[model samples]
Target: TEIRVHQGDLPNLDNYRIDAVAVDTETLGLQPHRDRLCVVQLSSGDGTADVIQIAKGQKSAPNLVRLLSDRDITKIFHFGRFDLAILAHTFGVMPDVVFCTKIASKLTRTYTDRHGLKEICGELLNVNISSSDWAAETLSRAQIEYAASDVLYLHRLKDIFEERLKREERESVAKACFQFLPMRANLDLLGWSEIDIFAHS
Candidate 1:
């Protein structure tokens, strides 16, 4: 279920290939979003994991829109609310059927901050996850492996969380909380121009 693809593999941009290379990002720390690195994780759900690639820059959002909107893939994210906020701001459309396990766990436990992806993954699936350094030119081997592991495990983690919820009769809560995400204002457009701000408003 673990797969990796580099940017060198994608050309047409419409092929919906599982693994494709994407733009990389690194900011010089002068801008507000200087350290932001945006990437895409693709999955075909065919049990073979058709492809998985990461796009690492702000410009990658448009292509990500094309990939997600063109396909009927159900994306599963642990804390996709904020991520979706960013995507919705960048791309007009976000994925369908996004289930945030972090929110879901809150319902089952009646506590806040109960479900972080790494914690959930480690506790539920015995996986270790850590972050990467943005100050470097490229990600280290450990960084790439850790990053890839996040999405690779997501394909299965989504199913595992849902199964556990169904067995516990919490499907209603899961559905109600995660069925739809709210609108996220387009920060790039807003920041780029005042006209952009008025246009969206």
Candidate 2:
């Protein structure tokens, strides 16, 4: 597995001819406004992972914005709600073609609600991961490994969920949720994080 860290932002990736890219981000905290964006990691499921460290107080990365905004390349995420929400705020772009593994797992909801990355990755992909202190001046090996691992196995998880969702006949339902995820994340950024509008309250 090759890990490359690009300072400030990502360069154009069109030359790689990437079709679908597994992506994940590390922020200061759960809230996009207060925490801010820190790092964006990506992998095409080809044993090479690229980690982009967004400089502090930086607003735009044209190359990255273009990559995420590209409709032809599918952007896969674990719990896309937070990632997409933050990405939308950070880059002022909402990825068009997207897939969320958590949404897929929910469609195939079963015995346990262990749809988290750790549980799903461990159960299916046999990969363990964890990360923290992303806003620090220097990142340790564990932190980098955790970040890289998140995207590295996400592509595999998507295929796993894809098969399960298809066999269970809920592929369409899952895609609908995936499509609505960006809007859902936007709602979170719009200060409606805790309220559910669908409830008949």
Candidate 3:
């Protein structure tokens, strides 16, 4: 089912800082080199809003580590456990305040096979996103745009989840959930595959 959307034309490539990151499986030990890693960040709030390309000239992990320091600001991600784990393992940190719409949907018992951000935002928030097969690739234009949009809506979604949590009286629980991420993530890291383990120091 196609959902209508009017979030305005897709963001101009010229107006954003686009970086590419790749998970390198060819290395051993934790904190492997930031091989082929892309660290993309756009100004969503206070702080530097310039298109700073921290790229091949600079190591990806360190660049990402610097970006992770902005964790005091909340982050929004959908079904982001694995993503967070990978980021933490590589950069040595994860977002302390995370708003995962997947968890929110699960808590509200509104989950479905279509509970992904694209589908959920389309159905629940009237904001549709592209989910074409191309969206799964890192370099595809559609995928890049999709990724940018994902981070884009996060600031707004944090508000939505906050309201829901307060209404459901789950704000404390939700806060604890995000707070426990570091410990839980540490344990979860133990189950990584050889390729992933190779990246773990």
The most accurate candidate by lDDT is 2
When sorted by lDDT, best at the front, the candidate numbers are 2, 1, 3
- Per-residue accuracy of model 3 over 1-201 as CA lDDT, tens digit each: 111121112134342232212111111223323332233434442222222222333323443344444545455556555456655665566655555667776655344655667766676668776623321123454434443555545545556766777888887777666676555556566653234333555
Point out where model 2 deviates above 4 Å. Answer: 14-16
Q: Flag regions of model 3 displaced more than 4 Å.
A: 1-64, 109-114, 131-140, 192-201
Q: How large is the C-alpha RMSD of every model relative to the true structure?
A: 7.2, 1.6, 9.7
Error of 1 at 76 (Å): 0.7
Q: Rate the local accuracy (lDDT) of all candidates.
A: 0.50, 0.84, 0.46
Query: Local error of candidate 1 at 99, Å?
Result: 1.7
lDDT accuracy of residue 54 in candidate 3? 26
lDDT of 2 by residue, 1-201 (tens): 688888777777753467888989999888888888999998889877888888888888987887887888899998988899999988889886889988877777586788888888888877776547788777777777778988888888888888999899887888788888888998998999888868987
- Put down candidate 1 lDDT per residue, 13-110, tens digits, no spaces: 54345432211222233233433333444444443222223345434445556655643445556566555545554445655555566766665544
Q: Tell me how candidate 2 scores on lDDT.
A: 0.84
Candidates in order, TM-scores: namely: 0.62, 0.94, 0.59
Q: What clash pairs does model 2 have?
A: none
Give the per-residue Cα lDDT of candidate 3 at 183: 52
Q: How close is candidate 3 to the true structure, as a TM-score?
A: 0.59
